[PDB]
Amino acid sequence: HIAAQQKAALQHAHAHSSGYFITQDSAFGNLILPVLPRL
Amino acid sequence: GGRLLLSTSLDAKDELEERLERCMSIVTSMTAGVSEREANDALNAYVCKGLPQHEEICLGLFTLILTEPAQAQKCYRDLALVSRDGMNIVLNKINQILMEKYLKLQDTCRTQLVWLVRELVKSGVLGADGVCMTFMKQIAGGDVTAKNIWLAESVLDILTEQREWVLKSSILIAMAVYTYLRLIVDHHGTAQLQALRQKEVDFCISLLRERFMECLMIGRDLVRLLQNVARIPEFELLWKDIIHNPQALSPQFTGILQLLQSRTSRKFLACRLTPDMETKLLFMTSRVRFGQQKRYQDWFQRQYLSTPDSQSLRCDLIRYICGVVHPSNEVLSSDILPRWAIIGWLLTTCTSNVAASNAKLALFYDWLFFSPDKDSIMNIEPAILVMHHSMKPHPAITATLLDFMCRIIPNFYPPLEGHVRQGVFSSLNHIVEKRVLAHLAPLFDNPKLDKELRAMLREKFPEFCS
Amino acid sequence: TFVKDILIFIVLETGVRTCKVADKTGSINISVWDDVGNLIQPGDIIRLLTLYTDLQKIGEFCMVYSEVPNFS
Numbered sequence: 001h002i003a004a005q006q007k008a009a010l011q012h013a014h015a016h017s018s019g020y021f022i023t024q025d026s027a028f029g030n031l032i033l034p035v036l037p038r039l
Numbered sequence: 040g041g042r043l044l045l046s047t048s049l050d051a052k053d054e055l056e057e058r059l060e061r062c063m064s065i066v067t068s069m070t071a072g073v074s075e076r077e078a079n080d081a082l083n084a085y086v087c088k089g090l091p092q093h094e095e096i097c098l099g100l101f102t103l104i105l106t107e108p109a110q111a112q113k114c115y116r117d118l119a120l121v122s123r124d125g126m127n128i129v130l131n132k133i134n135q136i137l138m139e140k141y142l143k144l145q146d147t148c149r150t151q152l153v154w155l156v157r158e159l160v161k162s163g164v165l166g167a168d169g170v171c172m173t174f175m176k177q178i179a180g181g182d183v184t185a186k187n188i189w190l191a192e193s194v195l196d197i198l199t200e201q202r203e204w205v206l207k208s209s210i211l212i213a214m215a216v217y218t219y220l221r222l223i224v225d226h227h228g229t230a231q232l233q234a235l236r237q238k239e240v241d242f243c244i245s246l247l248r249e250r251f252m253e254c255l256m257i258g259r260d261l262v263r264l265l266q267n268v269a270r271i272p273e274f275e276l277l278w279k280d281i282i283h284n285p286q287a288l289s290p291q292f293t294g295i296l297q298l299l300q301s302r303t304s305r306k307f308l309a310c311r312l313t314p315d316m317e318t319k320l321l322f323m324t325s326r327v328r329f330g331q332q333k334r335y336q337d338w339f340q341r342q343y344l345s346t347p348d349s350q351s352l353r354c355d356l357i358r359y360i361c362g363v364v365h366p367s368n369e370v371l372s373s374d375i376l377p378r379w380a381i382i383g384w385l386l387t388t389c390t391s392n393v394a395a396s397n398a399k400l401a402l403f404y405d406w407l408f409f410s411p412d413k414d415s416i417m418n419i420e421p422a423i424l425v426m427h428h429s430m431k432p433h434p435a436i437t438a439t440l441l442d443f444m445c446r447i448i449p450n451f452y453p454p455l456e457g458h459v460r461q462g463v464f465s466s467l468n469h470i471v472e473k474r475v476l477a478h479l480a481p482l483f484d485n486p487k488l489d490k491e492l493r494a495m496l497r498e499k500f501p502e503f504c505s
Numbered sequence: 506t507f508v509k510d511i512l513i514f515i516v517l518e519t520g521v522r523t524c525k526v527a528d529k530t531g532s533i534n535i536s537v538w539d540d541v542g543n544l545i546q547p548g549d550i551i552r553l554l555t556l557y558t559d560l561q562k563i564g565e566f567c568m569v570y571s572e573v574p575n576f577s
Contacts, residue, residue: 009392012391012392012393013392013393013396014270016391016393017224017267017270017393018223018224018227018267018268018269018270018271018274019224019266019267019268019269019270019393019397020266020269020270021393021396022450024446024450026442026446027442027489027491027492028435028438028439028441028442028489028492029392029395029435029438029439029442030396030399030439030442030443030446031392032392032393032396033396033400033443033446033447033450033451034266034267034396034397034400035266035447035450035451035452036262036266036269036278036295036451036452037266037269037275037278037282038453039278039279039282039283047544047562048540048541048544049541049544049545049549049560049561049562050561050562051552051561051562051563318566318567319566319567322566322567326567326569327569328569334517334547334548335566337547338547338548338565338566339566
């Protein structure tokens with residue numbers, strides 16, 4: 001709420017998925033986005 | 040009750056199984072009560088009388104190999120000796136069994152069939168690479184049942200042990216890499232799965248590093264598979280090489296753009312649906328009337344999409360719907376269930392934010408680097424039509440897709456933001472030029488959409504919001 | 506040989522052992538029992554007010570039908 005919502009969503013992705021995700025301050029269900037790895 | 044297939048009291052007698060049992064009877068009668076040389080003499084004599092006879096003996100020995108493990112080594116030896124067609128007829132029936140019967144194949148026969156395929160590979164039998172590909176197609180995505188996991192590992196062990204042979208076929212390298220990169224995503228949450236995943240990881244990395252230019256034929260969807268496994272340590276390292284040292288993978292590999300601008304062959308998109316999934320999806324997209332889809336969706340959902348492990352399958356289905364299924368104009372103008380409606384359904388079945396996010400990206404994957412000289416209107420039209428048709432009954436779907444489309448542009452890969460913006464711009468222009476949606480303003484500035492979302496759209500694409 | 510004239514149909518529902526089945530002409534209830542009743546699944550294509558009996562499954566899913574009229 002809203003940074004907390006992003007944090008939780010990203011944590012759930014990291015726990016259960018091997019995909020690369022970043023957070024977004026989305027109000028429309030896109031708190032995370034699958035994107036290419038950033039170095 | 041047959042020995043080849045599982046059958047219930049309810050099940051009709053299988054024609055293929057029936058025929059194979061008769062072939063086996065023909066063989067056993069010519070070999071009963073005799074030596075091993077006398078048997079081979081009679082089989083050889085009979086086979087020479089013609090190819091229907093040759094077929095009966097070859098298939099009879101084949102069926103003995105599948106149903107009688109104690110006799111299989113001898114029967115395989117006898118098969119190799121009498122075969123007059125390089126075992127062509129046997130590989131044909133193997134492919135038919137895999138494509139049509141695998142789900143009903145008895146456990147003993149599955150085990151024997153893997154053993155047999157390993158033998159065919161060792162013998163260097165012509166067409167064995169095609170059999171391996173057909174076998175991989177039966178490994179279901181989003182399925183961690185004991186039987187499916189067993190097959191993933193059994194096929195992998197053949198490919199790993201016979202890697203030198205694998206290297207002889209460029210297309211087999213790419214298909215195996217595509218298949219196993221995808222399966223890796225499902226293989227976690229258990230000791231057995233961890234062991235399997237590590238084997239799959241090492242196998243893919245080795246082919247990717249030793250034969251990158253072969254793997255590169257996959258094209259754009261290879262990036263999608265690689266980002267889905269990016270957090271595994273070996274793939275973090277591979278990604279570092281892809282981004283920082285692409286020449287180390289191959290002097291012909293300039294960088295990620297080259298892959299992203301090359302669209303994926305339908306061969307790869309289709310290999311990640313089992314035959315039953317294809318048959319049911321093709322049926323829904325060709326025979327089911329719009330408005331009559333509920334029970335079919337329920338049936339499919341229950342069989343394929345009702346577990347947490349099954350969520351990963353949705354992306355394969357979406358890419359398939361978008362890149363493989365291109366209905367004719369006749370179908371397109373009729374009242375058949377449209378592709379957008381299937382996509383919409385699949386989106387709503389996501390039970391996790393991860394699966395929903397991956398599904399959205401899969402839906403938009405051909406938009407990102409879209410070029411109208413190469414990519415088809417058919418690949419990008421379901422996304423725009425899901426947005427258009429959802430606006431009235433499910434505005435939240437439209438809103439989430441529009442928000443995703445705006446946010447993916449600077450974020451997918453920041454150094455390529457300009458390319459991604461141009462891809463989405465080109466997709467939208469192509470959609471308008473092809474009259475899929477004659478005007479974008481009624482969508483982008485729809486009164487039902489949140490005004491801050493609409494401000495972001497107008498900021499990103501002012502040329503479309505007037 | 507069609508439902509409306511009351512044989513191949515697709516199993517719509519499983520109900521203790523009542524099943525709604527259908528073809529292109531409408532739906533109808535059929536009474537099955539025993540182990541067959543535990544084998545029949547929604548989506549099954551079966552070759553055969555209430556319908557009565559053998560039953561053989563010849564496939565699944567890929568059959569067009571109509572829910573209406575419900576002849577029971």
